[PDB]
């Protein structure tokens, strides 16, 4: 139940709906003009945010101190208004929880959450041939289009949904260090 008050919340408050020429994603804000995406979200130098054209000033796809990927992409967007700053919300090490909720909104899964159980540390996974590691692993019945979704525990921003296989979804974990 608190998960869910706290998704719904953050959710509203922090997220908005992506198009990229690649596909339509969740993407949630963390502070200043700083969001993420999945890396295969691939961003180009203007993306389309809540249906409005906005450019891209920069963006990182993000690698470890081995170049090994993270299937994730910083982008600094170019928009007066500021995200409220959620870091105090993203763990500096990857998080295990018992009940956590996965919430996606795109114009295919308008406002949906999904309550995905335990979430464990699973790290390393070859993701489409392409070594990956800091993934979150859930189980849950997956569709194509949740990429991006945030994956939540109460009073916790856990990662960014980057794929699903059956019954299987993998988070890569959201932390504090990418953002300072």
Do not use: E, M, Q
């Given at each position: 139940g608190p998960a869910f008050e706290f998704a719904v919340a953050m959710m509203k408050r922090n997220s908005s709906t992506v198009k990229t020429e690649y596909g339509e994603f969740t993407m949630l804000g963390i502070y200043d003009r700083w969001a993420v995406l999945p890396?295969?979200?691939?961003?180009?130098?203007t993306i389309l945010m809540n249906d409005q054209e906005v450019g891209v000033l920069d963006a990182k796809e993000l690698v470890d101190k081995?170049?090994?990927?993270?299937e994730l992409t910083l982008l600094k967007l170019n928009r007066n208004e500021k995200f409220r700053?959620?870091?105090?919300?993203?763990?500096?090490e990857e998080v295990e929880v018992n009940e956590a909720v996965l919430a996606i909104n795109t114009?295919?899964?308008?406002n949906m959450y999904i309550p995905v159980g335990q979430v464990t540390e699973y790290g390393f996974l070859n993701l489409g041939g392409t070594p990956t590691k800091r993934m979150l692993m859930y189980n849950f019945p997956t569709r194509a289009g949740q990429c991006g979704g945030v994956l939540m525990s109460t009073g916790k921003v856990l990662g960014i949904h980057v794929g699903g296989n059956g019954h299987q979804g993998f988070s890569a974990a959201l932390l504090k260090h990418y953002f300072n």
């Open positions: 890396r295969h979200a691939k961003p180009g130098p081995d170049g090994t990927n993270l700053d959620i870091r105090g919300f993203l763990a500096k114009s295919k899964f308008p």
